Design a protein around this ligand. Structure first.
Ligand SMILES: Nc1ncnc2c1ncn2[C@@H]1O[C@H](CSCC[C@H](N)C(=O)O)[C@@H](O)[C@H]1O
Length: 290
């Protein structure tokens, strides 16, 4: 199906590296991360659907839980407040379908991604679910969201679901500044990211480690209030999530043919140990535009 292209004024030297980690067919990825392709951890509580694959169910439940945190923290998330939404680093597109279902009167849902294979998959799912009129896909670096069409229609809602970690500090700055200009006051930003809880001096395009404080500063420097900040999911749940991903890799990619899946196994093992030692956590950040 159709994807719109958006100019890159500045040069993200890191972009082609990020693209290569997501370049493999969705048909392969399905066997590793589940049939809905959620790719930023899971919440494994009593509201999780027991009939879907744990990765699909825990992934959806994680997104739902973040909206509950945003709501409790006083985010403007009523059905009448969300007319335009953006999914920044949208992966295979599960959040686009989630947003379309949760906000059936949301006029415009923009997904931005640098991975063509991921967007071509998302395009097929959006097309087959009949959401093509509302959901728009952009082959577009997060730093270039300033050039997305119809600037007169402001963003009410922005999602950074495990995409932020791939950004250079410069791309993070350019993305947050551009989002600030395109988002109306009281617009909600929903962030999930793996952040380090130690000084980074001591240290899958997994470079550009960040901290809660580094992310907090990037938000407040670019006209966003942080209204909720906490560990989510728990280190225990994230280790469990990596466990399920590793079990799928052991089953389907035992002899580590594919370098991207070998790299993911390494991160699953190595980052799970960092989570065990409490050197890092998954964090939910809810912010709003000033
Ligand atoms: N500068 C950038 N601009 C756009 N997308 C980016 C980006 N850096 C990383 N990404 C994207 O961020 C995603 C990280 S994986 C997470 C995918 C999706 N948010 C989910 O929760 O399932 C990938 O799709 C990657 O291509």
């Amino acid at each position: 199906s159709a994807i719109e292209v958006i100019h890159s004024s500045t040069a993200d030297h890191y972009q082609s590296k990020i693209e290569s980690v997501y370049a493999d067919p969705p048909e392969e990825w399905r066997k590793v991360i589940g049939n809905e392709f959620w790719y930023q951890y899971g919440v494994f509580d009593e509201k999780m659907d027991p009939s879907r694959l744990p990765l699909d169910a825990s992934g959806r439940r994680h997104m739902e839980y973040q909206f509950e945190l945003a709501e409790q923290a006083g985010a403007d998330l009523s059905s009448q407040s969300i007319r335009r939404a953006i999914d920044i680093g949208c992966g295979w597109g599960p959040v686009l379908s989630f947003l379309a279902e949760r906000y059936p009167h949301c006029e415009r849902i923009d997904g931005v991604n640098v991975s063509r294979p991921q967007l071509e998959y998302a395009s097929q799912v959006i097309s087959r679910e009949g959401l093509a009129a509302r959901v728009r896909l952009y082959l577009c670096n997060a730093k270039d969201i300033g050039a997305l069409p119809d600037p007169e229609l402001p963003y009410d809602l922005a999602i950074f679901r495990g995409s932020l970690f791939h950004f250079t500090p410069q791309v993070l700055q350019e993305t947050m500044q551009s989002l600030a200009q395109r988002m109306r006051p009281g617009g909600t930003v929903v962030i999930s990211e793996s952040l380090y809880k130690v000084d980074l001096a001591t240290y899958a395009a997994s470079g550009h480690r960040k901290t809660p404080d580094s992310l907090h500063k990037a938000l407040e420097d670019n006209g966003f209030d942080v209204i909720d900040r906490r560990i989510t999911p728990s280190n225990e749940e994230v280790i469990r999530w990596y466990g399920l991903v590793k079990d799928n890799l052991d089953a389907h990619y035992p002899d580590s043919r594919n370098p991207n899946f070998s790299e993911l196994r390494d991160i699953a093992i190595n980052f799970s140990d960092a989570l065990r030692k409490d050197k890092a956590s998954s964090f939910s950040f809810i912010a709003r535009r000033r």
